[PDB]
């Protein structure tokens, strides 16, 4: 017996019973709830459904804002052991002719005092423009595509190269899409994002997400996960007729 759970569960039972009474939750209503949950099981979407609606809140109690980088959710599609990119310019493993424009990501990783953190590993992950993540779609191999680890050079600079990401929409036919589009008459679009996770000994882990300026769904996140201080300016440099989206974010890790 955990007393954390005896205390949380019992309050939580007493709340939901009251919700039921306040809102006259009927039996067929009930049977539909029960039934919808079941089908969230079957599509394997519990982690999407919950993160969709609640990661944002658990992430607000979990970390604080100040003079460093802000956390943001991790969502459902992170995968461990993604591969070290070393290279002439390091480039997310990706497909022959992987759809989209070329994107150069530059930046640095440092502590709340300015010092650069040579001992860090940035994991990145993002979804094809087709709108799937590797390891989690039947439209993509269980391989590491668009996922990789980067390491600050000894002066703290980071830079990698990938496609530039575009607005993702949660499968409109899954339980989560269906609630979102139909039952809620809304939408299931997220704005484009690069997911980052940075770790370093001596520092507190960072899980966050970089967004893009003027993004269609900037204010519309069907996951409600956006924070302005993370909406990024894009710049457009040509080299041999070839249009790099340039982006640049400077990470601060907190100590301990």
Ligand X SMILES: Oc1cccc(O)c1O
Binding site for ligand MYY (CB under 6 A): 1-2, 4-5, 8-9, 12, 16, 19-20, 25, 29, 32-33, 36-37, 54, 179, 183
Site string for ligand X, 176-215 (x = CB under 6 A): --------------x----x--------------------
Tokens of 35: 């039934």
Write out 68-89 in H/E/C secondary structure. CCCCCCCCCCCCCCCCECCCCC
Tokens of 156: 């703290």
Kindly tell me which residue out of 68, 69, 71, 76 binds ligand X, with binding defined by CB under 6 A: 76
- Is residue 211 part of an annotated ligand binding site? no
By CB under 8 A, is residue 41 in contact with its own copies?
yes
Residue 216 touches which of its own copies, ligand X, ligand MYY, none (Cβ within 5-8 Å per kind): none
Residues 208-217: contacts with CB within 8 Å, 24+ apart?
208/69, 208/70, 208/71, 208/72, 209/72, 209/73, 210/247, 210/249, 212/164, 212/165, 212/247, 215/167, 215/191, 216/167, 216/189, 216/191, 217/167, 217/189, 217/190, 217/191
Q: In angstroms, what is the minimal distance from the CB of 222 to ligand X?
A: 8
By CB under 6 A, is residue 175 in contact with ligand X?
no
Kindly tell me which residue out of 103, 158, 170, 179 binds ligand X, with binding defined by CB under 6 A: 170
CA distance 147 to 195: 10
Residue 223 touches which of ligand X, ligand MYY, its own copies, none (Cβ within 5-8 Å per kind): ligand X
- Is residue 168 part of an annotated ligand binding site? yes
For the purposes of burial, counting CB atoms within 10 Å of the CB of 53, is it exposed (0-12), middle (13-18) or buried (19 or more)?
Answer: middle
Q: In angstroms, what is the minimal distance from the CB of 20 to ligand MYY?
A: 6
CA distance 152 to 158: 5
Count of H helices and E strands in the chain?
5, 11
- Is residue 23 part of an annotated ligand binding site? no
CA distance 248 to 161: 12
- Give the residue with the Cβ less far from ligand X, 77 or 160: 77
Q: For residue 108, which phi and psi values (nearest 5 degrees)? A: -155, 160
Interface residues toward ligand X, by CB under 6 A = 48, 51-52, 73, 75-77, 127, 168, 170, 190, 195, 223
Residues annotated within the binding site are 133, 168, 193, 195
Residues annotated within the binding site for Fe cation are 133, 168, 193, 195
Interface residues toward its own copies, by CB under 8 A = 1-2, 4-9, 11-13, 15-17, 19-21, 23-27, 29-30, 33-34, 37-38, 40-42, 46-47, 50, 53-55, 57-62, 179, 182-185
């Amino acid at each position: 017996a955990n007393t954390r759970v005896i205390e949380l569960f019992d309050e939580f039972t007493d709340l939901i019973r009251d919700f039921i009474v306040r809102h006259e939750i009927t039996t067929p209503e009930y049977e539909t709830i029960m039934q919808y949950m079941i089908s969230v099981g079957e599509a394997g979407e519990w982690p999407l459904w919950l993160d969709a609606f609640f990661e944002t809140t658990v992430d607000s109690v979990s970390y604080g804002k100040g003079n460093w980088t802000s956390s943001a959710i991790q969502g459902p599609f992170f995968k461990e052991g993604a591969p070290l990119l070393t290279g002439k310019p390091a480039t997310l493993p990706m497909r022959a002719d992987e759809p989209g424009d070329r994107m150069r990501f530059t930046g640095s990783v440092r502590d709340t005092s300015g010092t650069p953190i040579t001992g860090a590993v940035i994991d990145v992950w993002h979804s094809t423009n087709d709108g799937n993540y590797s390891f989690f779609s039947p439209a993509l191999p269980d391989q590491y595509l668009l996922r990789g680890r980067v390491v600050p050079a000894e002066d703290g600079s980071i830079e990698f190269h990938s496609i530039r990401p575009v607005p993702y929409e949660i499968p409109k036919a899954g339980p989560t899409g269906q609630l979102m589009n139909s039952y809620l008459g809304r939408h299931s679009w997220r704005p484009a994002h690069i997911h980052i996770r940075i770790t370093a000994d001596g520092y507190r882990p960072l899980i966050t997400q970089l967004y893009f300026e003027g993004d269609p769904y900037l204010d519309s996140d069907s996951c409600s996960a956006v924070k302005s201080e993370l909406v990024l300016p894009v710049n457009k440099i040509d080299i041999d007729g070839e249009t790099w989206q340039l982006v640049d974010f400077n990470f601060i890790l907190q100590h301990n």
